[PDB]
Each structure stands twice: as structure tokens, then as C-alpha cells.
Design a protein around this ligand. Structure first.
Ligand SMILES: C#CCCCCCCCCCCCC(=O)SCCNC(=O)CCNC(=O)[C@H](O)C(C)(C)COP(=O)(O)OP(=O)(O)OC[C@H]1O[C@@H](n2cnc3c(N)ncnc32)[C@H](O)[C@@H]1OP(=O)(O)O
Ligand SMILES: Cc1nn(C)c(C)c1CCOc1cc(F)ccc1-c1ccc2c(c1)c(CN(C)C)nn2C
Ligand SMILES: [Cl-]
Length: 385
């Protein structure tokens, strides 16, 4: 590929590799006063719109755009169906800016046809903590693809982020762009076997009949960690200590404040599930996963694949395998069809024994305006929604 847009940006070229001693911006000594104050030009008939995600109607417009036009798998069987409540949660983390929730409308219909978002977070990359924007939910309507709208959205959110004296960003994508700092395959653990077979997600054969498949993935409805329970507000301090200490081992992670722990982990039904094990009033283990359904395209019987996505999991009183087995059980108890996880943190070590299967694509991790050594995904300690 030519990367005609991306090679104008402060990112590595596709062949760039850096030693471990390199960990710095491509462009330093940036000045807020020099940042463009004018919005990037859109094609005629289109206008910028500042979305208010706390307004139900604006939020529902983003929801509809994404439901109809957001990420599909490689085979166009599934399309992500983030719920409106999920989008509210994902976009209103501590210190969020409404002006970083950027829509594009088609003037004649007043309809949203494009979106991009960012939230602020402190990111530790190779032991150096940098204030960054986390970019997500970039979407252009299917009818307007390949018209170079996405670089306009990217340049406009870059401009707005730079106005806040922030010069780095983290983002993930499935497409290969210049240039990943890490690449993580995803793995799936079947829960509702029959449904997964009926929609083509899973397969049978003459050895693995339907009944044998169901038996293979059967789970015992008893926790390894008996007192694992839904997180409560009182647990924020202990989760902050447990997770914050755990994450320091990785090459890439968010440095969460207590306010961020409360936001990202306190349970919201059909959005975010966090469970904790409290011993002596101290939090010693945690499980978390978020709800991300995929619409099943064209299916007559099922509209939705109800998937739970591994988020952050820490154990000090059990094995990581026992902890993730409990995560699968808790996902089953909450009526999820499948448990999805990336090969980040310690996850890959449990995939074989817990009967995960390898998926057909991977998620790449990227930094904007940062040069450093890349790393295997076991060194990644951050999950983007
Ligand atoms: C400091 C501060 C810095 C802040 C900025 C940091 C950088 C942020 C980059 C964006 C990160 C996005 C993270 C995500 O949210 S993940 C989910 C992506 N959401 C989807 O997968 C939904 C379905 N899909 C779509 O809605 C569209 O395909 C897209 C993704 C909007 C792309 O639009 P389309 O009409 O195809 O393409 P056009 O407008 O002609 O633009 C082509 C140029 O664009 C590049 N590109 C494509 N996909 C990208 C993508 N996902 N992220 C970034 N760049 C992407 C591509 O390479 C090319 O540029 P070149 O010529 O190669 O240099
Ligand atoms: C099921 C299913 N449904 N769909 C629609 C897909 C792609 C699958 C496969 C299953 O993907 C995953 C499974 C995991 F454990 C973890 C991550 C993904 C994943 C893959 C590609 C991704 C995204 C998320 C996102 C969303 N954040 C991260 C920006 N963007 N991209 C391009
Ligand atoms: Cl139990």
C-alpha cells in the first residue's frame, strides 16, 4: 500500500523498527498557540456537529449510525451492535470533552453520516507516562466509503486534541496501518454451543457431533473462588490498588485514577460486569468483562450474538486458569453466548486448557506521534472497547 495519508503523519513508516532505548515523540516541543483554530473543510453539503452523548436523542443518532455502519468481521457475517448505554459509558469517562465527540451531518437530511471520538487518559508506554487521547468509534456511512472522509475526521480530532496540549494518542484497529506497536489475535470460548453452530460461528464434524460439542463446552455452575461477587462502590479503593499494581508489569497500560476505576468497573447491566473477591475487607481477585453484541447479518432465527469480552482480570488467591474459568462461568450466568479474549496480558496461557478457539483476525495496537520498540501482545496491558 501507498499510505498516502498516513505517511504525512507522525507515525512510523511500515519498515521502521526502533531499539528498546528509543521511547519518545516523533515531534516534540509542540505549541498549543500554533494549532489551527479553523475546522477542517468538509465536502459541500456536509457539516461538523458536536454530539451530546448525554442527550438521549443525540446518543441514539450515534447508536443508529454505528448499528448500521460500524465494524464487521472479515467475512461480513457480524456487525458490532454497541448499545446506547454502552456508548454513554465508553464516552463519558473522567475528564471527557464533549467537543471530542465529533459527528458529521448531511445537511439536506440533517442525518448523522460520520463519527469519531476520543477520551483522555494517562498511558504508560515503556515505563513513561504520557497524557494521551484514546481514539475510538471512527465510522463513515457505508454509502460514503472510499471518499477520503476518514482522514478529515482524523485530522479534525487531532486538531481538537492538540488544542488541549495533548500530542499523543492510542488507538486500535483491525486494518494494518503504519505501524503497530503490538498485534493481538482474538480467541473465543463457546458457551451456547447450539446457537453458535446454527449461525455458522462454530463447526461440527463426524467426530464432533452436536451432542459431543455440547458436552465438550459444558461448564460446572460452581465458582473456583466461592465469594466472587459483583463489585460495589465500597470496592473502588481496593480494585484501584489491585489493578493498578498488577498493570505496572506491562509495556503499555493506562494509569487509572480512583475516579477512572469507579467509572470503568462499577457494574452497569448489559454494559460492564466486574466481580471481586474480598478477604479481610481487601480486594484480592477481580474479574471483568463487557457486553458487546454483534448483529448477525441476514439470519432469520437469531438477530444477535451476545458476546462477553474479557476486560481486566487479576488473581492473587487462585491460578489465572481458575480465575478465567470463573470469568467464563460468570459470563454464562449472565446469558452470554460466547466469551471473547485477546492474547494480551496473561490470557494466552489459559486458552488451550479452557477450550478457546483461535479467531480469524487480530487487533493491532497503535500510538500516534510516538516511536518505541514494538512488543509481543503478552506485554500489552490495556483493552480498548
Ligand atoms: C495527538 C492526537 C492524535 C489523534 C488521532 C490519532 C489517530 C486516530 C486514527 C483513527 C483510529 C480509529 C480507531 C477505530 O475507531 S477502529 C474502528 C474503525 N471503524 C470501522 O472499521 C467501521 C467501518 N469502517 C468505516 O467506517 C470506514 O471504513 C472507515 C474506518 C471510517 C474508513 O473510511 P473509508 O471510507 O473506508 O476510507 P477513506 O475515508 O477513503 O480514508 C482512507 C484512509 O483512511 C485510512 N484508514 C482506513 N481505516 C482506518 C482506521 N480504522 N483507522 C485509521 N485509518 C484508517 C486508510 O488507510 C486510508 O489512508 P491511507 O491512504 O492508507 O494513508
Ligand atoms: C464476533 C465479532 N463481531 N465482529 C463485528 C467482529 C469483528 C468479531 C470478531 C471478534 O473481534 C474481537 C474479539 C476480541 F476478543 C477482541 C476484539 C475484537 C475486535 C476485532 C476487531 C475490531 C474490534 C474488536 C474493534 C473495536 N475496538 C477494539 C476498536 N474494531 N475492530 C476493527
Ligand atoms: Cl458457586
Amino acid at each position: 500500500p501507498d499510505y498516502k495519508f498516513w505517511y504525512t503523519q507522525p507515525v512510523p513508516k511500515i519498515n521502521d523498527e526502533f531499539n528498546e532505548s528509543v521511547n519518545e515523540p516523533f515531534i516534540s516541543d509542540n505549541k498549543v498557540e500554533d494549532v489551527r483554530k479553523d475546522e477542517y473543510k468538509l465536502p459541500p453539503g456536509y457539516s461538523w456537529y458536536v454530539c451530546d452523548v448525554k442527550d438521549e436523542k443525540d446518543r441514539s443518532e450515534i447508536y443508529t449510525l454505528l448499528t448500521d455502519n460500524y465494524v464487521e468481521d472479515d467475512d461480513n457475517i457480524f456487525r458490532f451492535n454497541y448499545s446506547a448505554e454502552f456508548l454513554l459509558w465508553a464516552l463519558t469517562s473522567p475528564n471527557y470533552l464533549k467537543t471530542w465527540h465529533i459527528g458529521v451531518k448531511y445537511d439536506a437530511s440533517n442525518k448523522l453520516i460520520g463519527f469519531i471520538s476520543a477520551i483522555p487518559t494517562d498511558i504508560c508506554i515503556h515505563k513513561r507516562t504520557i497524557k494521551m487521547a484514546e481514539v475510538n468509534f471512527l465510522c463513515v456511512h457505508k454509502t460514503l466509503r472510499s471518499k477520503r472522509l476518514a482522514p478529515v475526521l482524523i485530522k479534525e480530532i487531532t486538531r481538537r486534541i492538540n488544542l488541549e496540549n495533548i500530542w499523543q494518542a492510542i488507538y486500535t484497529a483491525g486494518v494494518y496501518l503504519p505501524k503497530p506497536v503490538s498485534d493481538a489475535r482474538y480467541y473465543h470460548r463457546s458457551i451456547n454451543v447450539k446457537k453458535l453452530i446454527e449461525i455458522g460461528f462454530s463447526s461440527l464434524n463426524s467426530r464432533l457431533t452436536m451432542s459431543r460439542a455440547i458436552k465438550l463446552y459444558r461448564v460446572e455452575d460452581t465458582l473456583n473462588i466461592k465469594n466472587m461477587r459483583l463489585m460495589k462502590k465500597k470496592d473502588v479503593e481496593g480494585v484501584h490498588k489491585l489493578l493498578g499494581s498488577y498493570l505496572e508489569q506491562f509495556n503499555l497500560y493506562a494509569v487509572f485514577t480512583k475516579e477512572e476505576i469507579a467509572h470503568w468497573f462499577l457494574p452497569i447491566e448489559n454494559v460492564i460486569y466486574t466481580y471481586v473477591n474480598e478477604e479481610n475487607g481487601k480486594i484480592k481477585d477481580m474479574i471483568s468483562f463487557y457486553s458487546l453484541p454483534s448483529q448477525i447479518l441476514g439470519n432469520d432465527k437469531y438477530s444477535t450474538l451476545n458476546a462477553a469480552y474479557s476486560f481486566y482480570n487479576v488473581t492473587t488467591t487462585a491460578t489465572f486458569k481458575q480465575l478465567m474459568q470463573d470469568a467464563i462461568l460468570l459470563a454464562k450466568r449472565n446469558n452470554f453466548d460466547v466469551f471473547n479474549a485477546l492474547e494480551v496480558m496473561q490470557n494466552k496461557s489459559v486458552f488451550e486448557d479452557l477450550k478457546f478457539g483461535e479467531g480469524d483476525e487480530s487487533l493491532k495496537y497503535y500510538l500516534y506521534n510516538w516511536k518505541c520498540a514494538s512488543f509481543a501482545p503478552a506485554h500489552v496491558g490495556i483493552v480498548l472497547l
